[model samples]
Target: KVFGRCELAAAMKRHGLDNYRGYSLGNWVCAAKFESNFNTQATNRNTDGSTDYGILQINSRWWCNDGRTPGSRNLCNIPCSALLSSDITASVNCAKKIVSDGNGMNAWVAWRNRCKATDVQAWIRGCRL
Candidate 1:
């Protein structure tokens, strides 16, 4: 499932992603926008044989166990398939873990590529959150 702009912003808040890890809600929304266009089932394969999953694109390298990546850490202690569900709690919590690991939002390079200089507020404008 995919989400609209403001819908994603509000949904993220309900999952406690707002201002998570010192990053603003807009930052999160922006990353989701570029990472997967707010898609719940998005997946990308990394060159290292790991894959990115879900709206926030959590990595299988360490964050999730997909069996597709050898030497998986599965630090989130959840299957990577969980990240693709329309229920976004797993994705959000995993995202929190990724950021808390000292990488912050930079874990998703998609954010740094555009979210860095974008008008983050625009991502949440008119949303009563």
Candidate 2:
């Protein structure tokens, strides 16, 4: 499901992601914009034939299952479809675990490419935290 930017922001804040894992809220918000535009059902096929799943665009290569994407570690221990739900608790929890594993927000390429080293204040403009 597609969600408005503010709605996504509010949800992220509610999920205690206002400044999760040492990354700014704007960093995460900007990543969501680039990754999936806050759409829970978004999916993308990568150049390596791996698939990225959900609002975070987590890769099926290591994170979740699509049944067809073989050799996935399923590190999140949930189906990729779980990340596609409007209720994003599972996705947020998994994302935290991913961050804990050393990459931090750098786990999402979208964050490194788009949100990292960029002025992201606009991402949280008027949201008031």
Candidate 3:
């Protein structure tokens, strides 16, 4: 599913993304924008045989086991396919784990380059919280 900006914002909040790891909901929204544009089926394959899955663009290297990313460790303890689910349940949990894994929000390049200086609040300005 392709979510509108505000829709994605509300969805993430429902999954407890608001202020998780000192990063606001807007910060997450902004990173998702660049990472997957709120598209649930989004994915990016890494050159090293790892792949990023779904809206958060989580990698298969350390977080998920795709059985394809050489010696992949399933830290999230789920198939990589689960991350592409539209339900966003597994994806959100894995995302939370990623941040809490001593990596913080910096675990995603989307957060470092695009989300850092962005006026994240604008991502959900008119949305009903």
Candidate 4:
């Protein structure tokens, strides 16, 4: 949610996400940058008729309901709008669940295409986590 790198890193660490599921803070931050650029209100409608929501861009397919998308499984059991808040606890929690659901960061296309196997030190550089 328009957060500085260190601010996000600190909050994520507070939520036990610094190294959760074997993903580094750099990975998470880089994913956030490519997905939503740290904007909590970011939403993108995909060609597949699904929407990506919030910072991590959790999909409406299996994560949250966007109201217009039908057959949403909504595994997160939260409104898609809930992910678009300055307070990111919900987003972080849902992201953790997504990562644990056998996909890890693969659940995010941005992570796969941009963050995966890349040198992401710049995402955390000078952040002082």
The CA lDDT of each predicted structure is: 0.90, 0.85, 0.88, 0.89
Per-residue accuracy of model 1 over 42-97 as CA lDDT, tens digit each: 99998999999999988898989998899999999999999999988999988888
lDDT ranking from best candidate downward: 1, 4, 3, 2
Worst 10 residues of 4 by lDDT: 120-129
Model 4, stretches more than 4 Å misplaced? Answer: none
lDDT of 2 by residue, 27-108 (tens): 8789989999889999999777779888988888888888877677899889888989999888888888888898788888
In candidate 3, list every pair of residues with a backbone clash.
none
Residue range 1-129, candidate 4, lDDT tens digits: 597777887787888887899998889889988899888999999888999999899999899988878888999999999999999999999999999999789989999999898997778888766
Q: Pairs clashing in candidate 4?
A: none
Q: Name the TM-score of candidate 3.
A: 0.95
Root mean square deviation (Cα) for candidate 1: 1.0
In every candidate, how many clashes are there? 0, 0, 0, 0
How does model 4 score by TM-score?
0.95
- Which residue segments of model 3 deviate by more than 4 Å? none
Clashes of 3: 0
